């Protein structure tokens, strides 16, 4: 399944910025 | 700012008024150093935030929008700013908080609003882990965080078995973690038997860093004797081979410790 609303554009970044924090 | 986000803990108390009121105040763990304690301190705030995970317990047949999942999602992100805050990590801990999570890490669904769920709650564990610090790393060991990275691992998006790997890492790095990992040999061959089926993986869907991260692994399983005789044994042949050789050209570190652990191993 591959739509994304704003919702998903939103926690896909909130996930990948609260990653970046761990220096990966 | 501080008026801003009094207002914003009062305003999570009308429905009207609450996803704003999470998103903004996630919004301040960038620029507001003291927010954790805010949070934690005001009455009810935790709770608030801890009514937000629990209410989707129930939407996990996997029923999650993506609405749902991103409004979680916040919550989770202030947990993790209570989590990396000195002042309310011990606290955090001794509530608990970790388990309100481990449901998310658990669940098999492959829908997107559970992977952003399953991302940032492993991302508050990380941030645990990432401090190193011995009661963190005691705290995980007696919750059985293991099992739950370890199914993540073999079976999650690349990007959550990197951060799955990651934090049974730094688990394994600490000295109380590889020696409760080497107690049983069960735990030691569940561990290598889960790295060993992602090499497998590795090789057919290559990631440098998770395989950096795997490797890691394989590398502090080597500093325990009873692991080292083990591994004498079983580790995976691609480790020794060419099979990385186009994934590692570039990763001086890797490759170091690749050498490293095969040198550990006789």
């Known amino acids: 399944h591959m739509w994304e609303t704003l919702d998903d554009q939103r926690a896909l970044q909130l996930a990948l910025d609260q990653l970046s924090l761990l220096g990966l | ?41 005001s009455f009810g705030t935790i709770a608030a ?30 947990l993790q700013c209570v989590a990396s805050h000195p002042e309310t990590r011990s606290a955090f801990l001794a509530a608990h908080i970790p388990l309100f999570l481990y449901p998310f890490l658990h669940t098999v669904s492959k829908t997107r ?16 882990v990432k401090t190193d610090e011995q009661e963190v790393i005691n705290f995980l060991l007696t919750t059985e965080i293991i099992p739950l990275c370890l199914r993540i691992m073999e079976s999650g998006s690349e990007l959550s078995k990197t951060v799955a790997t990651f934090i049974l890492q730094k688990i394994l790095l600490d000295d109380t973690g590889l020696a409760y990992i080497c107690q049983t040999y069960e735990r030691f061959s569940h561990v290598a038997m889960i790295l060993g089926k992602m090499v497998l993986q590795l090789s057919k869907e290559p990631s440098a860093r998770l395989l ?55």
């Open chain 2, 113 to 128: 609003p559970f992977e952003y769920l399953r991302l940032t709650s492993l991302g508050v564990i990380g941030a645990l």
């Open chain 2, 49 to 78: 935030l801890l009514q937000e995970i629990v209410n989707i317990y129930p939407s996990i047949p996997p029923t999650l929008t993506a609405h749902q999942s991103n409004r979680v999602c916040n919550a989770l992100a202030l």
């Open chain 2, 212 to 266: 950096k991260h795997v490797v890691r692994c394989y590398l502090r399983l080597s500093d325990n004797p009873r692991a080292r005789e083990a591994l004498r044994q079983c580790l995976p042949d691609q480790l020794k081979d060419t099979t990385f050789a186009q994934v590692l050209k570039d990763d001086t570190t890797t490759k170091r410790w690749l050498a490293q652990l095969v040198k550990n191993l006789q």
């Open chain 2, 1 to 41: 700012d501080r008026e801003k986000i009094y207002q914003w803990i009062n305003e999570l108390s009308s429905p009207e008024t609450r996803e704003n009121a999470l998103l903004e105040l996630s919004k301040k763990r960038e620029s507001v150093p003291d927010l954790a304690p805010m949070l934690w301190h």
